[PDB]
C-alpha cells in the first residue's frame, strides 16, 4: 500500500508533471505523502524517495545503478554517450570516466585557476563599470560567467559572453535543444504530425553544436598545440584498463556534455547563493569579512580560494536548500527489499528527490527551511548519503571540484569588491528547465573601490 | 551662366538628393561641372564650391559666416542652440564657445588621456579575446569606442558599449533621431499624414535623449561631486565676456551635441584609416614600426601619443580623402563678388564640398586618389585653406584636438598589438548618415601577444 498522489483515470499520475514547476510539485507531494511515493504514467512506474533512511539504501551501488530518466534519454539525442547520458555498462562510460577523472581532481584545479580568474575578473569589471541607478540581472550574469569559464578552461574557446546580449549560436541551439527535450515529457503520441516542426528544429540545433565542436577538435589536432585543458587531456589520454583513447565522436559528446552540465547548474548555485546572502545580512557580513581577510592580493591565488572556508559553507547551504540538478534516477540491479517494507524487482526504478532529502528533519533538525551555513562547520559530521547535491558513487558529478572552486573564487571576489542591495525585495520564483534558477533575481552592487 | 546639374521639372535639382549617397553624388557632379555649380530646389538655392581658390574666399570671416544647412536645422530640433547648431550671432554660441574652448585645448587632453586609455584598452582586450576563426566589424567597434570615450571623458557616464550588441537606449533614439533628420531632406510634401508615425517616434526619441541627459545633470548637481570632465566645467564655468554661466537647458544641448560628434565623425575617421592601412601595406608597415618604437609601455602616456608623428600623418591623409563630416554651409554677410566672377547677394548660401577641395589637382597634384601620408610630413607645406576636415575659423570643430588625440592613441595601440588582414578583399562602400563611414568593412586581427 505505497502512498501515491492523485490520479487522472487512464493517464494515472502523468498530468501532475504537466506544469512549469514539476520538481516543486513533487516536493509538495512529498510533504503530503512522506518518504516514499509511487508515481505511475501510462506504461511506466517509478518511486520517489525523500528520506535519508531510504536513500542510503538506494545509494548502495551493489543494489542500484544509475538509470537514464526520460529527460536524460532525450538529452542523449544531443549529449550521446558522453559521461552524463551513458549507462554504466557502456564501454565509453568507463573509458571516459578513467581518462577524465584525473583532469577533474581538486589538484587539477591549480591548472585551471588562471583561466577561472580571467572570466571572474571580466565579471567584476562589468559590475565596476555600471552606472549608479543600474542593476544586475543575477542568473543572466552568472550564466555568462560559468559558460565562459567551462569554454575557456576546458577547450580554450572564448564564448565572450560579457561582450554580448545575443548569446553564442551554439548556446541558443543548446538551450533550444534542452527546451525540446523538456517538453517531450508531456506529449502523447510522439509521432503526431503536429510535432513535425519540433523534430525539424531539434535536428538543426544538433548540427550547430556538432559542427562547432568537431571543428574545434580538428583545428586542435591539426594545430598540435599544447594547452593543459580538458580537450588536450582527452586527445592524448589513454584509459589504463583498456589502453584505448576516446575516439573523436565521443570527445565531442563529452564537450557538449561539459558545456551543458553544469554551466547551468553552477550558475544556478551562484544565483541561489547570492539570493540567500542578500536575504540574510548577518551571513553576508560574515562571508564578506572572510573575503576581505583572505583575498589580500588583487588577483586571488589558488591557495586563497581554498582558505575561503565560510564562503564554502555558504555554497553548501545553498546546495542543501536548492540543489540545482534536483533529482537523479536509479534502477534495481537485482530483486531487493527497500526499508524492510517495499519489495522491488530487478529493473524497478527510483527517483531521488534531492531537495526533500535535504529537508529530512531526522538529519537536519526542525529548522530545515532556514539558511544557516554553520550547519557545515564540519562537513564530516553529516551522515552518509544525507547531502547529495552531486549525486552518488561512481556516477557522481565529475565536475564537483571544478564547480565548487569556480563558485568559491567568484563569490569570494564578489564579496571583496561590492556591497549588495536587494533593491526590489525580490520574491523567490524558481524557474525549472530540468535545472533550477531564481528567475528575475536582481540586485544593485555598490563598489568598495578596491583595484584589480 | 553658372554650371548647374540636370533638373526634374518644377522640383529643379531636388531629386538629385533622393539617394542614400547624396555627398558622393554631389562629388560626381563637381567632377563634371568644376569648381562651382548652382543647385536649386523649390524656394531654395545654394552654390557648391570645390576649389581651393573659391573656398579660400568663402573662408574669409569678414565676408561669410556659418549657415545652418537644411540638415542642421532639422538636427537643431534635438541639438538646439548647442555649439554645432547655433548661429554665430546667438548669445549662447559665443557664451558656450568661451566657456568650453579651454576644456578642448591640447593641454586639456592630458586630463582626458587616462579615460581614453580605459576605453582603448577595452577595445584591445575585445580583439585579443576573439577566437582564430572570427573577424572584426570595424565601424561597429570604432563607434563603440568613440561613443564610450566621449561619454566617459565628458560626463563620467559609461555607455558600456563593449558589453552589448543592442546599444544603449539613448544611442538607439539618437541614431533614429539623426536618421529622421536626414529623411526629411529628400521626402517631397512633408505634411503628408503617412509620416504621422515618423513624427511620433521623433518626439519619443527627443524625450529619451533629454530625460537621460537632464537626469545626469541633475544627479551631478544633487551629488555635487567633481570629476575631470566637460559636465563639471559647464556647471562651474562662467563666460569671461558676459560673466554668465550656461543654464541647464543649454548644458543638455551641449551634451547631446558632443555625443553626436563622438558617435559619428571620429569612428568614421578610425574606420577609414584602418581601411587605407590594410589597402596600403607599406604605409601599414611604417605606422606599425612607429607604434612599436614609440609605445614602449603597456599603458601609453600622453607624451608617447604626441610622439606618433606618422600615425598622425595617416589620420590626416584619411581625412583628406574621406573627411567624415564632408560639407559645411556659409552665407554672404553682405553683397559681394566671389572669385571676380560670381556676384552674390546678402544672404546667398554657399556649400563647401570638403572631399572635392581635398582632391583639388592644382593644390595636391594629379595623383589625388592615392593614399600618401607623406603629403602631411610638414604641415607648413599645405597652402592656406586647402585642408579643412575640421571646418573654418571661429566656427571650426571645437573637438579637433580631442578627436585627433583619441584617434592617434587608439590607432597606435591597434598597430602595436595586432597584425591586420583584409580577409575579404573588402570593396569600399561608403554609407552616408550625414557623416561618412565604410559600411561592412571587416578585418581579421592576429595578436602580437604584447601584454597590456
Ligand atoms: O524524466 C523523468 O523520468 C522524471 C519525470 C518523469 C517524466 N515522465 C515520467 C514518468 C514516470 C515518472 C516520472 C516521469 N524527471 C524528474 O522527476 C525530474 F526531476 F524532472 C528530472 F527530470 F529528473 C530532472 F531533475 F529534471 C533531471 F532531468 F533529472 C535533471 F536533474 F534536471 C537533469 F536533467 F538530470 C540535470 F541533471 F539537472 C541536467 F542534466 F543537468 C539538466 F537539467 F538537464 F541540465
Ligand atoms: O541641407 C542642405 O541645405 C544641404 C543639401 C541641400 C542643398 N540644397 C537643398 C535644398 C533643399 C534640401 C536640401 C538641400 N546639405 C547637405 O548637403 C549636407 F547636409 F550639408 C551634407 F552634405 F549632407 C552633410 F555633409 F552631410 C552635412 F550635413 F552637412 C554634414 F556635414 F555631414 C553635417 F551634417 F553637418 C555633419 F557635420 F556631418 C553632422 F551634422 F555633424 C552630422 F553628420 F549630422 F552629425
Ligand atoms: C553546482 C554545480 C553542479 C551540480 C549541482 C551538479 C550535479 C550533478 C549531479 C547531481 C550529477 C548526477 C546526475 C545523475 O545521477 O543522473 C552530475 C553528473 C555530472 N556532472 Fe555535474 N553538477 C554540477 C557541475 C558540473 C560541472 C561544472 C561539470 C563539468 C564541467 C559537471 C559534469 C558532470 C558530468 C560529466 C556528470 C556525469 C558523471 C558520470 O556519470 O560519469 N557538473 N552532476
Ligand atoms: C574626426 C572627427 C571630427 C570631424 C571630422 C569633425 C568635423 C567638424 C566640422 C567639419 C565642423 C564644422 C561644421 C560646420 O561648419 O557646420 C565641426 C564642428 C564641431 N565639432 Fe567636430 N569633428 C570631429 C570631432 C568632434 C568631436 C569629437 C567633438 C566633440 C567631442 C566635436 C564637436 C564639434 C562642435 C561642438 C562643433 C561646433 C563648433 C562651433 O561652431 O562652435 N567634433 N566638426
Length of chain A: 452
- A434–chain B nearest CA distance, Å: 29
- A158–chain B nearest CA distance, Å: 6
Q: Pocket around ligand 4: residues whose beta carbon is below 6 Å from it?
A: B 66, 83-84, 97, 150, 257-258, 261-262, 265-266, 269, 323-325, 328, 389-391, 395, 397-399, 402-403
A266 lines ligand 3 (CB under 6 A): yes
Distance CA A48, CA A55 (A): 10
Q: Is B397 part of any known ligand binding site?
A: yes
Distance CA B316, CA B320 (A): 6
| Dist. CA B325 → ligand 4 center (Å) | 8
Q: What distance separates the 2 farthest-apart alpha carbons in chain A?
A: 64
Other CB atoms within a 10 A radius of the CB of residue A282 amount to 7
Closest residue in A to B212 (Cα–Cα): A133
Peptide bond into A262 cis (omega under 30): yes
For residue A289, CA distances in Å to A71, A121, A411, A417, B371 come to 42, 20, 13, 12, 60
C-alpha cell at B264: 559619428
3-class secondary structure per residue, B60-104: CCCCEEEECCHHHHHHHHHHCCCCCCCCCCCHHHHHHHHHHHHHH
**CB A57, CB A35: distance < 8 Å:** no
Which among A316, A306, A303, A319 is positioned nearest to A354, based on CA atoms? A319
Distance CA B409, CA B291 (A): 10
Q: Which residues contact A159 (CB under 8 A, 6 or more apart)?
A: A147, A148, A151, A167, A168, A170, A171
Other CB atoms within a 10 A radius of the CB of residue A114 amount to 12
Distance CA A403, CA A410 (A): 11
Closest residue in B to A215 (Cα–Cα): B133
Look at the block and give the residue holding cell 569678414.
B62
Tell me which chain B residues have a C-beta less than 8 angstroms from the C-beta of A158: 129-131
A150 lines ligand 3 (CB under 6 A): yes
The ligand that comes nearest to the alpha carbon of residue A230 is 3
Cβ contact B131–A163 (<8 Å) = no
- B409–chain A nearest CA distance, Å: 22
Closest residue in B to A118 (Cα–Cα): B129
In DSSP notation, B393-430 reads GGGS-TTHHHHHHHHHHHHHHHHHHEEEE-TT-PPP-E
What does DSSP say about strands B44-49 and B349-353: parallel, antiparallel, or unpaired?
parallel
C-alpha cell at B368: 589625388
B163 Cβ under 8 Å from any chain A Cβ: yes
3-class secondary structure per residue, chain A: CCCCCCCCHHHCCHHHHCCCCHHHHHHHHHHHHCCEEEEEECCEEEEEECCHHHHHHHCCCCCEEEECCHHHHHHHHHHCCCCCCCCCCCHHHHHHHHHHCHHHCCCCHHHHHHHHHHHHHHHHHHHHCCCCCCCEEHHHHHHHHHHHHHHHHHHCCCCCHHHCCCCCHHHHHHHHHHHHHHHHHHCCCCCCHHHHHHHHHHHHHHHHHHHHHHHHHHHHHHHCCCCCCHHHHHHHCCCCCCCCCCCHHHHHHHHHHHHHHHHHHHHHHHHHHHHHHHHCHHHHHHHHHHHHHHCCCCCCCHHHHHCCHHHHHHHHHHHHHCCCCCEEEEEECCCEEECCCEEECCCCEEEEEHHHHCCCHHHHCCCCCCCCHHHHCCHHHCCCCCCCCCCCHHHCCCCHHHHHHHHHHHHHHHHHHEEEECCCCCCCCEEEECEEEECCCEEEEEECCCCC
Tell me which chain B residues have a C-beta less than 8 angstroms from the C-beta of A446: none
Tell me which chain A residues have a C-beta less than 8 angstroms from the C-beta of B157: 131
Look at the block and give the residue holding cell 544603449.
B168
- Out of B131, B133, B163, the one facing A126 most closely (by C-beta) is B163
B75 lines ligand 2 (CB under 6 A): yes
Determine phi and psi for B240, rounding to 5 degrees.
-60, -30
Distance CA A38, CA B360 (A): 89
Residue A397 is a catalytic residue: yes
Determine phi and psi for A395, rounding to 5 degrees.
-100, 20
Alpha-helix runs per DSSP H in B187-308: 196-223, 230-236, 248-261, 267-279, 281-294, 302-306
A156 Cβ under 8 Å from any chain B Cβ: no
Residue B265 is a catalytic residue: yes
Determine phi and psi for A336, rounding to 5 degrees.
-160, 165
**CB A418, CB A127: distance < 8 Å:** yes
What dihedral do alpha carbons A246, A250, A254, A255 form, nearest 10°?
Answer: 100
Check residue B385 and give left, alpha or beta (phi > 0: left; psi -120 to 50: alpha).
left
CATH classification number, A1-452, choose in 3.90.1720.10, 3.90.1330.10, 1.10.630.10, 3.20.20.80: 1.10.630.10
Q: Is B327 helix (H, G, I), strand (E, B) or coil?
A: strand
Look at the block and give the residue holding cell 583498456.
A242
The ligand that comes nearest to the alpha carbon of residue A75 is 1
C-alpha cell at A5: 498522489
**CB A246, CB A68: distance < 8 Å:** no
Closest residue in A to B168 (Cα–Cα): A165
Question: From the annotation, which residues of A make up the binding site?
Answer: 48, 397
**CB A346, CB A67: distance < 8 Å:** no
Residue whose Cα lies nearest atom 23 of ligand 4: it is B265
Distance CA A67, CA B22 (A): 69
Distance CA A207, CA A215 (A): 12
CA B275 to chain centroid: 17
Task: Provide the number of CB pairs (under 8 Å) joining chain A to chain B.
Answer: 30
**CB B317, CB B370: distance < 8 Å:** no
Neighbouring C-alpha atoms within 13 Å toward the C-beta of B83: 25
Distance CA B45, CA B28 (A): 19
C-alpha cell at A216: 574545434
Distance CA B376, CA A376 (A): 71
Q: Is B157 part of any known ligand binding site?
A: no
Which among B444, B84, B128, B410 is positioned nearest to B270, based on CA atoms? B410
Closest ligand 4 atom to Cα of B69: 16
Instruction: B86-90: list long-range contacts, CB under 8 Å, 24+ apart.
Output: B88/B394, B88/B395, B89/B65
Dihedral over Cα of A331, A336, A342, A345: its sign: positive
Which among A325, A361, A332 is positioned nearest to A30, based on CA atoms? A361
Q: Is B170 helix (H, G, I), strand (E, B) or coil?
A: helix
Other CB atoms within a 10 A radius of the CB of residue A25 amount to 16
Neighbouring C-alpha atoms within 13 Å toward the C-beta of B269: 32
**CB A401, CB A109: distance < 8 Å:** yes
* Order of strands across the sheet that contains B418-421: B136-137, B442-447, B418-421
**Running DSSP on this structure, what letter comes out for residue B228?**
S
Distance CA A162, CA A380 (A): 38
First and final CA of chain B: distance in angstroms?
A: 62
Which among B382, B261, B262 is positioned nearest to B313, based on CA atoms? B382
Q: Is B5 helix (H, G, I), strand (E, B) or coil?
A: coil
CA B86 to chain centroid: 17
Tell me which chain A residues have a C-beta less than 8 angstroms from the C-beta of B155: none
Tell me which chain B residues have a C-beta less than 8 angstroms from the C-beta of A160: 126, 129-130
Which among B375, B417, B402, B170 is positioned nearest to B266, based on CA atoms? B402
Distance CA A380, CA A394 (A): 20
| Dist. CA B411 → ligand 2 center (Å) | 28
Length of chain B: 452
C-alpha cell at B422: 583584409
Tell me which chain B residues have a C-beta less than 8 angstroms from the C-beta of A126: 160, 163
User: Burial of B107 by CB count in 10 Å (0-12 exposed, 13-18 middle, 19+ buried)?
Assistant: exposed
Residue A265 is a catalytic residue: yes
* Order of strands across the sheet that contains B44-49: B36-41, B44-49, B349-353, B327-332, B64-67
B162 Cβ under 8 Å from any chain A Cβ: yes
Which among A212, A157, A204 is positioned nearest to A180, based on CA atoms? A204
B211 Cβ under 8 Å from any chain A Cβ: no
Look at the block and give the residue holding cell 608623428.
B309
**CB A152, CB A402: distance < 8 Å:** no
Closest residue in A to B144 (Cα–Cα): A163
| Dist. CA A444 → ligand 2 center (Å) | 44
A165 Cβ under 8 Å from any chain B Cβ: yes
Distance CA A331, CA A351 (A): 9
| Dist. CA A258 → ligand 3 center (Å) | 9
Distance CA B312, CA B309 (A): 5
In DSSP notation, B338-406 reads ETTTEEE-TT-EEEEEHHHHTT-HHHH-S-TTS--GGGGS-GGGSPTTS--TT--GGGS-TTHHHHHHH
Which among A281, A309, A278 is positioned nearest to A293, based on CA atoms? A309
Amino acid at each position: 500500500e505505497m502512498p501515491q498522489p492523485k490520479t487522472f483515470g487512464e493517464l494515472k499520475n502523468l498530468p501532475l508533471l504537466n506544469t512549469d514547476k514539476p520538481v516543486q510539485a513533487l516536493m509538495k507531494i512529498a510533504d503530503e505523502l512522506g518518504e516514499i511515493f509511487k508515481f505511475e504514467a501510462p506504461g511506466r512506474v517509478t518511486r520517489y524517495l525523500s528520506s535519508q533512511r531510504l536513500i542510503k539504501e538506494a545509494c548502495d551501488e551493489s543494489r542500484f545503478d544509475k538509470n537514464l530518466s526520460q529527460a536524460l534519454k532525450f538529452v542523449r539525442d544531443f549529449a550521446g554517450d558522453g559521461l552524463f547520458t551513458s549507462w554504466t555498462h557502456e564501454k565509453n562510460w568507463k573509458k571516459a570516466h578513467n581518462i577524465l577523472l584525473p583532469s577533474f581532481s581538486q589538484q587539477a584545479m591549480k591548472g585551471y585557476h588562471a583561466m577561472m580568474v580571467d572570466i571572474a575578473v571580466q565579471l567584476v569589471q562589468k559590475w565596476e563599470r555600471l552606472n549608479a541607478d543600474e542593476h544586475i540581472e543575477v542568473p543572466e550574469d552568472m550564466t555568462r560567467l560559468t559558460l565562459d569559464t567551462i569554454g575557456l578552461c576546458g577547450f580554450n574557446y572564448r564564448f565572450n559572453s560579457f561582450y554580448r546580449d545575443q548569446p553564442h549560436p551554439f548556446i541558443t541551439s543548446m538551450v533550444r535543444a534542452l527546451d525540446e527535450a523538456m517538453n517531450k515529457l508531456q506529449r502523447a503520441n510522439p509521432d503526431d504530425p503536429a510535432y513535425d516542426e519540433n523534430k525539424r528544429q531539434f535536428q538543426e540545433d544538433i548540427k550547430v553544436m556538432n559542427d562547432l565542436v568537431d571543428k574545434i577538435i580538428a583545428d586542435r589536432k591539426a594545430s598540435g598545440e599544447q594547452s593543459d585543458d580538458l580537450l588536450t587531456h582527452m586527445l592524448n589520454g589513454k584509459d589504463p584498463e583498456t589502453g584505448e583513447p576516446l575516439d573523436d565522436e565521443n570527445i565531442r559528446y563529452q564537450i557538449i556534455t561539459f558545456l551543458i552540465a553544469g554551466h547551468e547548474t553552477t550558475s544556478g548555485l551562484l544565483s541561489f547563493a547570492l539570493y540567500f546572502l542578500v536575504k540574510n545580512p548577518h551571513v553576508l557580513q560574515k562571508a564578506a569579512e572572510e573575503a576581505a581577510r583572505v583575498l589580500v592580493d588583487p588577483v586571488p591565488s589558488y591557495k586563497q580560494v581554498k582558505q575561503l572556508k565560510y564562503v564554502g559553507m555558504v555554497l553548501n547551504e545553498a546546495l542543501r536548500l536548492w540543489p540545482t540538478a534536483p533529482a537523479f534516477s536509479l534502477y534495481a540491479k537485482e530483486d531487493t527489499v527497500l526499508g524492510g517494507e517495499y519489495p522491488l524487482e530487478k529493473g524497478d526504478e527510483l527517483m531521488v528527490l534531492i531537495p526533500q532529502l535535504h529537508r529530512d528533519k531526522t538529519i537536519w533538525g526542525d529548522d530545515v527551511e532556514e539558511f544557516r551555513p554553520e550547519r557545515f562547520e564540519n562537513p564530516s559530521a553529516i551522515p552518509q548519503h544525507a547531502f547529495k547535491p552531486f549525486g552518488n558513487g561512481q556516477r557522481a558529478c565529475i565536475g564537483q571540484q571544478f564547480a565548487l572552486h569556480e563558485a568559491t573564487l567568484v563569490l569570494g571576489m564578489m564579496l571583496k569588491h561590492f556591497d549588495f542591495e536587494d533593491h526590489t525585495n525580490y520574491e523567490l520564483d524558481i524557474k525549472e528547465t530540468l535545472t533550477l534558477k531564481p528567475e528575475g533575481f536582481v540586485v544593485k552592487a555598490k563598489s568598495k573601490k578596491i583595484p584589480l
